[PDB]
């Protein structure tokens, strides 16, 4: 029943009926549904497609839903204390504030890369007027999922 609910939520997610499902959208439905696994592991269960293979060729969602469930069971989701442990490294002056340019630098460059455009959207509407974000509010914003 919950998989059927996820299937209809995915049908409502899909951008147009012409999308039978692109691996790009497969990653996006992963991230948008109540999961957010690291991409190398889900690509591993798929079969590690090349970047051009993942871009050009198509995928079927039917087999994706079982592995979606399996990675959901693996539950690589973090924890609030773990997030605070991670973000506190940036709190160099120890007052609960981190610099937004540092966050865009590491979040774009260091891990799963995001272009400056989507990291800007990521901070759009919440970045402080001086430029220093308060990490407890940022972690809580992440917690909003």
């Amino acid at each position: 029943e919950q998989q059927e609910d996820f299937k209809e939520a995915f049908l409502l997610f899909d951008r147009t009926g012409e999308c039978k499902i692109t691996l790009s959208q497969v990653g996006d439905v992963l991230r948008a549904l109540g999961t957010n696994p690291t991409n190398a592991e889900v690509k591993k269960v798929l079969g590690n497609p090349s970047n051009e293979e993942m871009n050009a060729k198509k995928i079927e969602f039917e087999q994706f839903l079982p592995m979606m469930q399996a990675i959901s069971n693996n539950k690589d989701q973090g924890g609030y204390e773990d997030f605070v442990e991670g973000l506190r490294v940036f709190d160099k002056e120890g007052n609960g504030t981190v610099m937004g340019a540092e966050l865009r630098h590491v979040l774009a460059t260091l891990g799963e890369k995001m272009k400056e455009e989507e990291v800007e959207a990521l901070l759009a509407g919440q970045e402080d007027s001086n430029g220093c974000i308060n990490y407890e509010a940022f972690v809580k914003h992440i917690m909003s999922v």
Binding site: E85, R88, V89, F90, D91, K92, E93, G94
Partner: protein
């Protein structure tokens, strides 16, 4: 060529103890536990020895 000599022989990068201890304490959080008092110089000495 002198700029090569001084870059190889010298020390190209230095970070303030507060800025780096806070930045890379992540390498070994048991060397720099949170909440507990830690000296930046002495902590840096323990971390780098670790």
């Amino acid at each position: 060529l002198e700029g090569i000599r001084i870059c190889r022989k010298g020390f190209p990068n230095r970070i303030l103890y507060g800025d780096f201890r806070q930045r890379y304490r992540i390498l070994n959080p048991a060397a720099i536990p949170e909440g507990q008092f830690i000296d930046s110089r002495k902590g840096a000495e323990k971390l780098l020895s670790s």
